[PDB]
Design a protein around this nucleic acid. Structure first.
Ligand SMILES: O=C(N[C@H](CO)[C@H](O)c1ccc([N+](=O)[O-])cc1)C(Cl)Cl
Lengths: 122, 56, 115, 119, 229
RNA sequence: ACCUCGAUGUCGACUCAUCUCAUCCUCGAGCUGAAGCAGGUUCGAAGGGUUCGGCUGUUCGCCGAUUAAAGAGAUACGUGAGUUGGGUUCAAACCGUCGUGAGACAGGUUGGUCCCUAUCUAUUGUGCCCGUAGGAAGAUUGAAGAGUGUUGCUUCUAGUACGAGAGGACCGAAGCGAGGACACCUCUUAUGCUCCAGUUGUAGCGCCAGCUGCACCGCUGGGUAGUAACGUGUCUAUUAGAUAAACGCUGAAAGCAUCUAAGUGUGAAACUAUCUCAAAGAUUAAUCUUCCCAUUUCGCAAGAAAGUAAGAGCCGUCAAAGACGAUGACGUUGAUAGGUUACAGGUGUAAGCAUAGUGAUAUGUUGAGCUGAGUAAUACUAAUUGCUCGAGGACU
RNA sequence: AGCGAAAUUCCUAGUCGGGUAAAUUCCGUCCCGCUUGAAUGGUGUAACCAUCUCUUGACUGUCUCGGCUAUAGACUCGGUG
RNA sequence: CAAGGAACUCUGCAAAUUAACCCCGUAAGUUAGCGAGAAGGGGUGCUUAUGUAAAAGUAAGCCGCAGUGAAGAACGAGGGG
């Protein structure tokens, strides 16, 4: 699905355009990062507006996987490109509004502030 | 690689102990007196009381 | 004795439905899905286009594509699944039982509706 | 390990089975190897059971597998199939051909066998 | 131990649904009433076991000694004969239906001979990574792995006993435990058990009470479809 | 300077490792300048793991981000009869230095051949013969064994015990993970070469239409069964016994005190099994059930020739197996394989025809036609009116 | 004179800035240049190099992580060896 | 060959992506010749009519996932020696 050193889109108003993976979190050698799993990442190129520019590193939550995973019910979610959402340390986001739909699986880990500020959910 | 000490005649004999060919089973045709193969036709043709080939 | 290999269908009769509409690749469809996260079941509507329909007697499944904010969404549904309902609103002309071209084209390429 | 014969190919197998079934339909008795005879028996049976209708569609459909022989041309075998082969089988389903096991040769000592039609 | 076992033939895999909107793939096993052949008395042979037979066939199709043995005890002529340790309380000449052993959702284990694989390398047998396919390969580039534990006459000359090597795979008796069976069919004589089931499609499969969790139940009841004309 | 010059192929990387404990982590416990979290140190413990990248030819070393940590080591500083060659280091040439010279300098600098078809041992799988004092078919027991042995996060008890605030548990319960292993392929993708449809060029089937050959399978889009993972389950747990360190009673040698001398206890991923796998070639050859048996009797009674009569083997159709052998089912008393019929799944409107257009084409006849290996019946075809070994149990 | 840790710099993994998450390699500078240096040439240079070196856009099994089919061998059988 | 797209490796080695024709459009630098086919894009099928002598080109219509349908035909931009 999502592997080490992966560039994906930015789906929130943080100023960045491309996000690159730094390392998957959890235990060592996880080798993958699925929906809802937090991952340390960095920015690649950003517009002058925004609270973050080139050079800094953050922790983000993956919200879009192209391969997709099968839910416990039987509905296997799919997406075309890959997106992510940025936070600072806490569950609160670093951006006001989020572009694009977000999966329901975040409810299994919290992040209700992210879903409450979305335009469409699964 | 190759052998480092020569193989004795005993070694080759024990190796070829399995060389003996099996005794192939035979069968007697029901109309042409001969010892043919098994499940197979003889030189005449009647694999059973039924033919297939002309003469050979 | 012996086995029939049709017992797969024989036992599967416990979970089945005979009210599923017919649709292959282009008919405009809608799915109503029920979610259970509170005391009240939440109802979500999902309109869009068909991608594939496949199954033998229980593996009958389909794929629905929609668009939102210029981003496409593919969702896979099991036909025989509680609290999932399907309906057809506008069927259309198709040339293949399975399509895969929508993964790179969106908009200005809608399926022409047949007679 | 370079420069290798093209060897046996899927297209080669199709050509071989077409040639063998055409030859069998031409003469009726063929001495060959056991494996190829067993492989071509399926196509022989399919062609014979398809020939039982004598309509344009199936006759077009059997042109794919057919091929001319030394003694009879393409149209010759095409007419022969529905003239003196298909009418001979109308009550017997399948089993229009059979194989018997010949002896092994001496040059290569392969497995040789004869293939014939139904009496 | 309360271990009890029944044989059957696993015939295919097909998922069924239930309440809570949860997905669970299921496998279908054609069951058959197994006849008791004997019981080893615990005091008589120092171990307790129950021997049964199944897959009945034509009486004359079996060999003479087994036919005579079944004639002596009036046991139905069968093709398969096997026993299970510590199975207690089942006298001879009795027929067993699968409803006497397991509840609707208690823990189960399933055993069967693994499906065949033929000869295979250590790559497909011990998860050994493939050698480098780029920047120079050498005509060997898919290899069993180095084995040498030393060079000389002090820690060498020996290849380790039973180290992973490219060998036979499959066609061996395996077992998977902690299984929750979900479907009974006495009117049709079939069972449906959750999870993947080992064994080739059409082989002999043995269903027993798992020793992992000694009989703890948690039912799973099916949910009937509600949408209809 | 002790074996090697009649050649024991050197650094590092990849894969594969195995072993010790001076323990990196989990675990047990003591002491504390240990209020509690987190700590510092001594002893026990080898069960498992011990990250990914940038610079780097490198091991290092530095750094970035995570984790339970990023263990110290050992084996011709393991692993070229497994891969390469980035280099000390070959023949070409640069510069710097040295030399009056050819030239030299771990001074740096660009390029640059890595041979070997397996004899014995060892190991991984797997067969034939013989033996187990009758023969054969089955089912067992356990002799000695092998593998599996990692933890995290969230919540509750509980903002409780603790500490003045800050801050924040031991002990337990539940859910969710990652890693690895065992399997399986219904659901998701991967492949799916006599499967389906579109399709260019070219040459044929005389020609139109339609089909074939060839152009990697001609290309493309899918896709049967089986094989596969990224997909689905389960496993990592639990308890019992004896113990390391540690913790104790009663009790004296030593009127006291005191875990030890006796008796009697607590107590760790270590250990024995509980889990899984195989196992009577366990010669120390085990147990049980069933089936076959009694032709006086003839050479030097020597169990000598009538000598299986149960079964097994030869050959064949085959795959649930499969390099070969085996294994498993079946040989006209039959469903073992092929063919036929029907259905499944896939492909998606076969070909001809009529209509509309003028013309490529569209519509209806058409949920049609097609389809290797899927499934159930079918003796239509192929497994024959063939051959060999094989019973009176030396004695208890 | 010019140039300068450059193919020349041993202490050097010299300072700083950059490009990256991290830069012994890279580029512009700084200069006790241990031993730079102007015909054994210095400096700059348009085009070119099966030249060396470094960043980077599309691209892909190089890789995370392996799998499937096909042939010809490899395996059995027959002839030579 | 799914997703990632050089994270492998001393080094994007190998392999893959741009390929044929026609039409737009093309920079630094310079010895003014070049760089340049730079870079970056667009159209190619069949039928009808317009069309020169053929092909061009044009407009309309039709088919499909794609239309030099396969085959054979440059991956580039930078700074340094
Ligand atoms: O000479 C060789 N090996 C010699 C044999 O006497 C010996 O093994 C050796 C190996 C390495 C070495 N060295 O690296 O200095 C010296 C001797 C090989 Cl290079 Cl052919």
């Amino acid at each position: 699905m999502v592997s080490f050193m992966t560039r994906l889109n930015v789906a929130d108003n943080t100023g960045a355009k491309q996000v690159g993976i730094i390392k998957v979190l959890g235990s060592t050698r996880k080798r993958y990062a699925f929906l809802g799993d937090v991952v340390v990442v960095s920015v690649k190129d950003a517009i002058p507006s925004g609270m973050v520019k080139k050079g800094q590193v953050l922790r983000a939550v993956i919200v879009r996987t192209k391969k997709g995973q099968q839910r416990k019910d039987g509905t296997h979610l799919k997406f075309d490109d890959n997106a992510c959402v940025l936070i600072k340390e806490d569950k609160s986001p670093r951006g006001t509004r989020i572009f694009g739909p977000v999966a329901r699986e975040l409810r299994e880990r919290g992040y209700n502030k992210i879903l409450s500020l979305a335009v469409e959910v699964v | 690689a190759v052998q480092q000490r020569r193989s004795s005649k005993h070694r080759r004999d024990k190796r070829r102990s399995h060389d003996a060919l099996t005794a192939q089973a035979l069968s007697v045709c029901q109309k042409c007196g001969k010892k043919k193969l098994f499940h197979r036709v003889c030189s005449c043709g009647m694999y059973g009381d039924l033919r297939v080939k002309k003469a050979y | 004795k012996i086995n029939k290999q049709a017992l797969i269908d024989l036992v599967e009769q416990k979970q089945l439905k005979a009210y599923v509409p017919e649709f292959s690749a282009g008919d405009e469809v809608n799915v109503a899905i029920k979610l259970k996260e509170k005391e009240k079941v939440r109802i979500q509507n999902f309109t869009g286009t068909v991608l594939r329909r496949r199954g033998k007697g229980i593996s009958e499944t389909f794929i629905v594509r929609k668009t939102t904010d210029g981003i496409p969404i593919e969702k896979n549904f099991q036909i025989h699944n509680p609290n999932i309902s399907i309906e057809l609103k506008r069927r259309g002309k198709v040339r293949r039982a399975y399509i895969s071209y929508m993964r790179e084209r969106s908009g200005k390429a809608a399926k022409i509706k047949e007679r | 390990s370079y420069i290798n014969k093209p060897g046996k190919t899927s297209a080669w197998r199709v050509m071989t089975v077409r040639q063998q079934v055409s030859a069998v339909l031409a003469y009726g008795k063929i001495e060959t190897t056991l494996k190829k005879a067993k492989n071509t028996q399926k196509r022989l049976d399919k062609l014979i059971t398809l020939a039982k209708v004598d309509n344009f569609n199936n006759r077009r459909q059997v042109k794919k597998w057919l091929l001319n022989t030394n003694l009879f041309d393409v149209d010759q075998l095409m007419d022969h199939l529905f003239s003196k082969v298909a009418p001979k089988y109308e009550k017997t389903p399948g089993g229009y051909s059979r194989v018997l096991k010949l002896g092994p040769r001496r040059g290569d000592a392969t497995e040789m066998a004869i293939l014939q039609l139904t009496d | 131990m309360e271990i009890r076992g029944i044989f059957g033939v696993k015939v295919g895999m097909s998922q069924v649904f239930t309440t809570n909107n949860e997905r669970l793939p299921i496998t279908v096993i054609y069951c058959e009433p197994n006849q008791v052949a004997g019981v080893k008395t615990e005091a008589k042979d120092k171990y307790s076991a129950t021997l049964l037979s199944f897959d009945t066939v034509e009486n004359k199709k079996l060999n003479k000694p087994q036919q005579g043995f079944f004639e002596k005890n009036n046991l139905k002529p069968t093709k398969h004969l096997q026993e299970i340790r510590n199975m207690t309380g089942f006298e001879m000449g009795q027929q067993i239906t699968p409803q006497n052993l397991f509840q609707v959702g208690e823990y189960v284990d399933v055993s069967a001979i693994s499906k065949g694989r033929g000869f295979t390398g250590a790559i497909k047998r011990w998860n050994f990574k493939i050698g480098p396919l780029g920047h120079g390969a050498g005509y060997p580039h898919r290899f069993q792995g180095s084995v040498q534990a030393g060079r000389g006459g002090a820690s060498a000359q020996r290849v380790f006993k039973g180290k992973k090597m490219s060998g036979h795979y499959g066609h061996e008796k395996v077992t998977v435990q902690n299984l929750r069976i979900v479907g009974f069919d006495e009117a049709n004589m079939l069972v449906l058990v959750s999870g993947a089931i080992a064994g080739p499609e059409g082989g002999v499969v043995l269903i027993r009470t798992a020793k992992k969790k000694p009989g703890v139940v948690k039912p799973i009841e099916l949910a009937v479809q509600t949408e209809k004309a």
